[PDB]
Design a protein around this ligand. Structure first.
Ligand SMILES: [Cl-]
Ligand SMILES: [Cl-]
Ligand SMILES: [K+]
Ligand SMILES: [Mg+2]
Ligand SMILES: [Mg+2]
Ligand SMILES: [Mg+2]
Ligand SMILES: [Mg+2]
Ligand SMILES: [Mg+2]
Ligand SMILES: [Mg+2]
Ligand SMILES: [Mg+2]
Ligand SMILES: [Mg+2]
Ligand SMILES: [Mg+2]
Ligand SMILES: [Mg+2]
Ligand code: NA
Ligand code: NA
Ligand code: NA
Ligand code: NA
Ligand code: NA
Ligand code: NA
Ligand code: NA
Ligand code: NA
Ligand code: NA
Ligand code: NA
Ligand code: NA
Ligand code: NA
Ligand SMILES: [Sr+2]
Ligand SMILES: [Sr+2]
Ligand SMILES: [Sr+2]
Ligand SMILES: [Sr+2]
Ligand SMILES: [Sr+2]
Ligand SMILES: [Sr+2]
Ligand SMILES: [Sr+2]
Ligand SMILES: [Sr+2]
Ligand SMILES: [Sr+2]
Ligand SMILES: [Sr+2]
Lengths: 65, 56, 194, 46, 81
RNA sequence: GCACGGAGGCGAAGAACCAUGGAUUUCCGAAUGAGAAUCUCUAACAAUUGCUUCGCGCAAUGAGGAACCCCGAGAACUGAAACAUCUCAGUAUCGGGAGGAACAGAAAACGCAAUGUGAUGUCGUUAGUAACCGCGAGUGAACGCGAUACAGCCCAAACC
RNA sequence: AUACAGGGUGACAACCCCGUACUCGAGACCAGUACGACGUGCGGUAGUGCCAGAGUAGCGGGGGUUGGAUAUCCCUCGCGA
RNA sequence: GCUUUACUGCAGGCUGUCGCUGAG
């Protein structure tokens, strides 16, 4: 959602990686909040983060990094 | 000592276990041979025409 | 004029006479000490080899194979049988020794395909045959007008299905008329009565 | 007994499968865990 | 490529280890070693790991008990996630 | 998604869904660095081969598939109102192997004997005929003919 | 209505919805086949005993198998143009 | 299933012969 394919392709290789580490973190912290039985969730994002990561990873392989 | 109930109490040996190759609990851990898929005995998979009716 | 080859041929019509006799007596001493399947750089019977399709080229291999002489090596019946199916001593197998030889050779060279084979004698307890095998994956052969045919997929493991010359003879396929009613096109399609 | 790491993973999985069909699946399908196993009444593999 | 840290293991026993022994507990990939758990933890929360004890759980996962140096404060770390 | 929930989210930046192509594709598995009940230990075409720059450098094999197909191994119950030859039957089952189909195949054929036919399968027929057989029970073709489809070539040697 | 096949829709539906007839498009198979074209070069006379596949053809002992009977096919031992 | 100088066969052992197998 929030992150589209165009935007991802417009990022430089170094940006995708930084963007990747960032997404992985938001996710890790979401799984932490979830593990802590945290309610301030947004079930949509925890799902979106996974897709976003798969997208960047797909784009990274497509562009050669 | 009877061959029935009293002799059943001595059974605590583990022989057949889940097979790495086929997933069936047929891997004889003492023989290291699967009685179901043949693992440990043959590269080819264990099979026989008598596992079904002759004309089928 | 006569080819030099005809002289090898002529020598082998009487392997028990002349110089060939002394050669065999000498050779066999060495053969008896070799394995079951020994690769050899050159055919012992050149004329025969070339005649069967051999060529001095990359991808062409020749191997001498030895097999025990005699009939079947069968185990007597452990369960009830009628007198007829109790035989053990005089029962022979349906494949000749040359065919058994071709198969062992082909097992030794899994990637090669049997082209043909011929006899190189025997002693009182075994027989030797040399087998010509071809590398269907070598370009020197993929480009040979006389041998590239053996590169086709359906030629894979041809020996194991009786597609060899020795195979075809042994299957009673020589005759095109009388006598081949139950051999052609296959022993199996004819109910195995040939 | 002594369980290997793998044996242990399988045992764990079996334990997890031994849970009930979530209540919401009931409403959604508008009306059983056929694989419910008991440690005593049943026998697992291996 | 599998990650080392799966998520914080938050339970009554975990908190005690956090308040009383300056230890953090994590659910981690069972292929990870004690050393790989230490490194990953230091890099993720910028802390110093002193010791790591592991256990392959009956949930099919690996649990790690990570003690931080006296320089760091578990209570404060875990409290920012 | 099956699946009619709750919450929340995605979609006009055209999602869902469908077709084609691509990406990702854990471990065990022929399973191939060594070992192991799907894990572990210290760079790997393990093993067998061909070629070879003689270095795993380049390659092949392995296992699977409903049956079909080809090559080998090969019963007994049963029938004969017993039973041994015979029968059941080259069946069941076993070993090996290929393909999309296999196998066969351009005559040292046939032998309606001819001034005739003209690679090979297969189908119909020839025919339960010829032949076999405690001449018992039973077993059982072919040439030809009508069809289907058609297709004919390459070596060895001579001479170079 | 070149559509009265079938299904769905709160009951017996050509005309409510999907379809159905007609027409049209793509993929797969036929097939890298047929056709076409490139190259090669068919055939005939006379002379010449230059060449033409051996444990073979064939025979005998022992087995199996076959409708194969003296006249099937094969294996095995021995002999052998 | 068992027995034996029941019927018929089959392994196995003994023995001759041929091949392996040559020179004087
Ligand atoms: Cl072969
Ligand atoms: Cl005719
Ligand atoms: K019988
Ligand atoms: Mg030529
Ligand atoms: Mg056929
Ligand atoms: Mg529980
Ligand atoms: Mg421990
Ligand atoms: Mg391994
Ligand atoms: Mg009877
Ligand atoms: Mg019979
Ligand atoms: Mg009678
Ligand atoms: Mg019959
Ligand atoms: Mg005839
Ligand atoms: Na081979
Ligand atoms: Na139990
Ligand atoms: Na978890
Ligand atoms: Na996939
Ligand atoms: Na390989
Ligand atoms: Na090498
Ligand atoms: Na009867
Ligand atoms: Na009787
Ligand atoms: Na009879
Ligand atoms: Na006629
Ligand atoms: Na026969
Ligand atoms: Na004979
Ligand atoms: Sr007693
Ligand atoms: Sr008792
Ligand atoms: Sr015991
Ligand atoms: Sr084994
Ligand atoms: Sr099988
Ligand atoms: Sr093969
Ligand atoms: Sr009990
Ligand atoms: Sr638990
Ligand atoms: Sr024709
Ligand atoms: Sr000829």
């Amino acid at each position: 959602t929030v992150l589209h394919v165009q935007e991802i392709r417009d990022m430089t290789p170094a940006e995708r990686e930084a963007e990747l580490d960032d997404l992985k973190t938001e996710l890790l912290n979401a799984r932490a909040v979830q593990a802590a039985g945290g309610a301030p969730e947004n079930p949509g994002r925890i799902k979106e983060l996974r897709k976003a990561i798969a997208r960047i990873k797909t784009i990274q392989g497509e562009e050669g990094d | 000592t009877g061959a029935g109930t009293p002799s059943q109490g001595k059974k605590n040996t583990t022989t057949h276990t889940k097979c790495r190759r086929c997933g069936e609990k047929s891997y004889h851990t003492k023989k290291k041979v699967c009685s179901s898929c043949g693992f440990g005995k043959s590269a080819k998979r264990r099979d026989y025409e008598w596992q079904s009716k002759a004309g089928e | 004029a006569r080819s030099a080859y005809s002289y090898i041929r002529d020598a082998w019509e009487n392997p028990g006479d002349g110089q060939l006799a002394e050669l065999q007596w000498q050779r066999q001493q060495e053969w008896r000490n070799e394995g079951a399947v020994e690769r050899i750089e050159r055919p012992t019977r050149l004329d025969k080899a070339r005649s069967q399709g051999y060529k001095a080229k990359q991808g062409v291999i020749v191997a001498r194979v030895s097999v025990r002489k005699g009939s079947a090596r069968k185990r007597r019946h452990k369960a009830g049988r009628r007198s007829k199916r109790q035989g053990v001593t005089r029962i022979t197998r349906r494949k000749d020794i040359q065919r058994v030889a071709e198969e062992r050779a082909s097992r030794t060279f899994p990637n090669l395909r049997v082209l043909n084979s011929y006899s190189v004698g025997q002693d009182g307890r075994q027989k030797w045959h040399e087998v010509i095998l071809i590398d269907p994956n070598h370009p020197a052969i993929q480009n040979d007008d006389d041998l590239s045919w053996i590169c086709a997929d359906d030629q894979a493991d041809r020996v194991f299905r009786g597609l060899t010359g020795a195979g075809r003879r042994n299957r009673g396929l020589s005759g095109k008329g009388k006598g081949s009613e139950k051999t052609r096109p296959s022993l199996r399609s004819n109910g195995g009565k040939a | 007994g002594k369980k290997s790491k793998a044996t242990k993973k399988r045992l764990a999985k079996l334990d997890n499968q031994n849970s009930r069909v979530p209540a919401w699946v009931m409403l959604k399908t508008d009306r059983r865990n056929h694989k419910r196993r008991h440690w005593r009444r049943n026998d697992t593999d291996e | 490529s599998w990650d080392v840290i799966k998520h914080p293991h938050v339970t009554e026993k975990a908190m005690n280890d956090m308040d009383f022994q300056n230890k953090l507990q994590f659910a981690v990939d069972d292929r990870a070693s004690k050393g790989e758990v230490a490194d990953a933890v230091e890099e993720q929360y910028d802390v110093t790991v002193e010791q790591v004890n592991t256990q392959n759980t009956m949930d099919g996962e690996k649990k790690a008990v990570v003690r931080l140096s006296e320089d760091d404060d578990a209570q404060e770390v875990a409290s920012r996630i």
